[PDB]
């Protein structure tokens, strides 16, 4: 540099769009390596692709097991496809061990401290890595916490089948096979560069071999951008399905209609490939018991997450005011003025807005004298959501007249 | 393929490639492949975009293989990209595959597969072969019941022979080319009979008209035969079932070409809010498809209200318990054209 003027340079990098949205903020727990600070920030807030490159590696964490079977982590690549389908400002939680009990159990203690997360993803292939995380994350799927929709993955057609079988989970079966490639990096191979001369030339040839193959990723990262893309276009209340994935190559599996009839009733959604339209997300159910028809869809669960997440934001101007009758009539009006806008944008089905919602709060309507003397206030919000149309039936008759 | 070193012109010869032109249409024959073929892997469906792409796969052409003479006669007549699926895994790959409109028994026996594969819900129309031996008037009851009575299949009896081949050429090879060459020219609703065969194809066995009078009734066997004016041609347009709803293949193939183009015309309605403004956006996405099919002469009638009807709505076709189950029931009706099979000529001698 050092002199003003133009500076032409070749072989540049790739840049993406920013696409900000503060409603579906995911968190990416996986194998990342920090390069700039390396020390203290246990998880970093990035806002686009450039704050990722200014803080992280762009290098897959190579992992070798000695005759040797190797593993390459697509967490850096799976996050590129999140910024390519949708966008957002995801927190990135780098976690390389997944066996230290003192760090893994403090994942919910740091992820409730930031108060902006709605989605919970895991972009890794390994079952023994991934299923150790879902057990720690599953405390966020209780009724004591709000938001926190865990978008998951099943490696086969069978269910993930844990204690995270609650209504706040969704699984997406076929692993994608992205068209991008790598640019590469057992106890520090530079140590083994001195000891075993024969293994060093053996492992250096396989790194160049796996550099040429297109990487397969899970769809737990690509649908995290699909959950954001249909939130800017049609809001939360629309189903994140019937929308094409971008930037992927072929699928890994080619599941048909008759195999899908058990997986969808199980609660596992599926990316299904139609030629004339592309790789469309096909399915908007959740990992719930099939008898519970109330929360049986993604948006019916995800809108109710997003309403109470913004009602707590709206009720915070009420808390440490005095407890009497004019405090309730301001708190009742705050949720009434919020739910009326949701009735405006066709988020709630109905014709006249006393049907789409109701708020009931009062001295004897919901509380007692010993209830208010303790100092707490209870109101009953209730709202009717719109249920999407999964199946259609076309009945082709022939006798017109 | 020669390696290239210097920029210029290379004069390398390649004898007898038997080259055909690439073609584009909407008819995609799944070709059944016998298990002793080596350049196929099972639980896999390879795709052949043109005759040069098949000839890239097998290397060089030989007229002994029942598949090699099959796909040459396919690309000589109609063309279009085809899927080569081995027979022992054909029950797993066809429900997997989209873009499947007709399943071709190349030279193999698929009668056990079509009974489970071809359904009213699916969009296939299989075609397979008649017997390769001569069959007479006397054996009309024996070989007719060798096939099932499903309305989703057509049988062409006389196996082909060509000057460039040694083994006899099975007629479901050329009839998938004819189904793809007629849909481009005259549309789907015209019958795929009364059309010539290109590529130098000739029938093995001469068929009389009094022979064909017994194989047209009931479980019909369409037949190809040569005439004095034009040469060899297809002379049947009947499916296997002999009810008036699905008797002719142009009726069955139109209703199968309608459903594959309705379900992609209104595939936007998936996972949409199931209320009334989704419904009239659906009945209008169907109605100006069927009108565009109406103006091309695909349906019979004279008005647009004797031609088709699309009726949806709460209580018209779907109940309230069908709304909260997530179901949109759509009723669509059509009135296709029937072909003229017979023409009788009355010869009076005394003119008035």
């Amino acid at each position: 540099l050092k002199a003003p003027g133009v500076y032409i340079e070749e072989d540049a990098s790739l840049a993406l769009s920013v696409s900000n949205s503060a409603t579906a903020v995911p968190v990416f727990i996986g194998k990342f390596t920090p390069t700039v600070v390396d020390s203290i920030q246990v998880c970093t807030r990035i806002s686009n692709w450039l704050e990722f490159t200014s803080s992280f590696s762009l290098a897959p964490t190579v992992e070798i097991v000695v005759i040797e079977t190797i593993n390459l982590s697509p967490a850096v690549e799976a996050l590129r496809l999140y910024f390519q389908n949708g966008g957002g400002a995801c927190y990135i939680y780098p976690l390389n061990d997944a066996e230290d009990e003192l760090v893994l159990a403090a994942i919910p203690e740091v992820i409730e401290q930031k108060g902006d997360i709605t989605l919970l993803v895991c972009p890794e292939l390994d079952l023994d890595y991934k299923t150790k995380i879902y057990g720690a994350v599953s405390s966020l799927l209780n009724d004591n916490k709000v938001g926190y929709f865990l978008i998951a993955d099943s490696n086969d057609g069978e269910s993930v089948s844990g204690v995270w079988n609650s209504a706040k989970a969704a699984a997406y079966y076929p692993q994608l096979e992205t068209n991008l490639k790598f640019s590469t990096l057992p106890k520090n191979l530079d140590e083994l560069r001195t000891i075993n001369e024969a293994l060093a030339q053996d492992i250096d040839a396989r790194l160049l071999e796996e550099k040429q193959r297109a990487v397969i990723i899970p769809p737990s990262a690509a649908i995290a951008g699909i959950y954001c893309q249909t939130d800017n276009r049609r809001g939360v209340w629309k189903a994140p399905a019937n929308v094409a994935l971008t930037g992927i190559g072929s699928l890994l599996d080619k599941v048909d209609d008759e195999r899908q009839g058990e997986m969808n009733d199980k609660g596992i959604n599926v990316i299904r490939s139609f030629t004339d339209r592309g790789f469309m997300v096909w399915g908007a159910r959740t990992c719930v018991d099939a008898a519970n028809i109330s929360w049986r869809y993604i948006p019916v669960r995800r809108l109710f997450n997003s309403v109470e997440r913004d009602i707590r934001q709206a009720l915070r101007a009420v808390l440490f005011e005095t407890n009497s009758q004019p405090t309730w009539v301001r708190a009742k009006a705050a949720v009434d003025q919020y739910l009326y806008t949701l009735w405006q944008k066709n988020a709630l089905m109905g014709a006249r807005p006393e049907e789409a919602y109701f708020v009931q709060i009062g001295q004897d309507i919901t509380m007692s004298e010993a209830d208010i003397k303790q100092g707490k206030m209870i109101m009953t919000v209730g709202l009717a959501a719109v249920r999407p149309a999964e199946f259609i039936i076309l009945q082709f008759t022939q006798d017109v007249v | 393929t020669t390696v290239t070193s210097y920029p210029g012109v290379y004069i390398e010869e390649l004898n007898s490639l038997a080259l055909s032109v690439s073609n584009s249409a909407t008819a995609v024959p799944v070709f059944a492949v016998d298990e002793q073929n080596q350049y196929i892997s099972e639980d896999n469906a390879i795709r052949i975009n043109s005759w040069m792409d098949y000839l890239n796969l097998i290397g060089n052409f030989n007229n002994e293989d029942k598949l090699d003479v099959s796909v040459r006669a396919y690309f000589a007549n109609g063309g279009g990209y085809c899927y080569l699926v081995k027979t022992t895994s054909l029950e797993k790959i066809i429900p997997t595959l989209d873009d499947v409109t007709l399943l071709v028994a190349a030279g193999e026996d698929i009668k056990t597969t079509v009974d489970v594969l071809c359904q009213p819900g699916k969009g296939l129309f299989a075609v397979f072969d008649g017997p390769e031996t001569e069959l007479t008037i006397n054996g009309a009851e024996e070989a007719k019941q060798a096939y099932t009575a499903t309305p989703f299949a057509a049988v062409y009896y006389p196996w082909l022979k060509a000057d460039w081949a040694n083994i006899d050429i099975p007629p479901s090879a050329v009839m998938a080319g004819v189904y793809a060459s007629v849909d481009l020219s005259r549309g789907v609703w015209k019958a795929p009979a009364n059309v010539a065969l290109k590529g130098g194809l000739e029938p093995k066995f001469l068929v009389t008209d009094e022979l064909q009078g017994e194989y047209n009734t009931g479980r019909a066997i369409n037949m190809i035969r040569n005439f004095s004016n034009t040469g060899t041609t297809v002379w049947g347009a009947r499916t296997l079932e002999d009810k008036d709803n699905w008797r002719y293949v142009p009726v069955r193939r139109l209703f199968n070409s309608v459903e594959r183009d309705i379900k992609r015309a209104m595939s936007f309605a998936m996972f949409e809010p199931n209320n009334q403004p989704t419904w009239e956006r659906v009945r209008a996405a169907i109605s100006n498809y069927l009108y565009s099919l109406w103006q091309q002469g695909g349906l019979a009638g004279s008005k647009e209200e004797d031609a088709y009807f699309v009726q949806i709505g709460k209580g018209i076709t779907m109940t309230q318990e069908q709304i909260d189950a997530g179901q949109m029931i759509v009723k669509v009706g059509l009135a296709a054209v029937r072909p003229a099979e017979f023409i009788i000529l009355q010869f009076t001698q005394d003119v008035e």
Binding site: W343, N346, A351 | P277, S287, Y291
Partner: protein, 148 residues
């Protein structure tokens, strides 16, 4: 003392509440105008005097539907930019007078094969309190009017 169910079956319907669906999208427009069904007439007169009138050729249809610009949304331009030499991706337009919230349709107009001409960029002037409003004049065929 008429009820609210006799008003919904006798009283006419007002223009100020409608939804437009361009292809598979829903774009909220401000003013849609100019759709009609016109025919030309053929006259034939002869001798002793017979004034035969027949309607002849169907006349062309170009509708003009108008929208304010929005800070992120650029939807009408990428349709008038999509045209190279001979073809556009032709869409279909459905206009429909609705209820207050869009839970019911009351009368629907369907437009068959619509391609855009003449996107008009807004008129800037520093003395007006207007919203930056652009319009698109798409030519099509076969406007039909569908009840409910």
């Amino acid at each position: 003392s008429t009820s609210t169910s006799q008003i919904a079956v006798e009283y006419p319907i007002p223009v100020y509440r409608f939804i437009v669906s361009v292809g598979d999208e829903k774009i909220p427009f401000n003013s849609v105008s100019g759709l009609d069904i016109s025919y030309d007439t053929i006259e034939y007169r002869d001798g002793v005097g017979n004034w035969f009138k027949m309607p002849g050729q169907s006349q062309s249809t170009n509708i003009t539907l108008r929208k304010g610009v929005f800070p992120g949304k650029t939807e009408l331009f990428d349709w008038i930019n999509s045209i190279q030499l001979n073809q556009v991706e032709k869409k279909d337009i459905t206009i429909s007078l609705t209820n207050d919230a869009g839970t019911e349709l009351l009368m629907t107009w369907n437009v068959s094969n619509a391609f855009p001409t003449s996107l008009t960029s807004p008129s800037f002037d520093a003395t007006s309190n207007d919203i930056a409003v652009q319009e698109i004049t798409l030519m099509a065929d076969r406007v039909i009017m569908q009840a409910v």
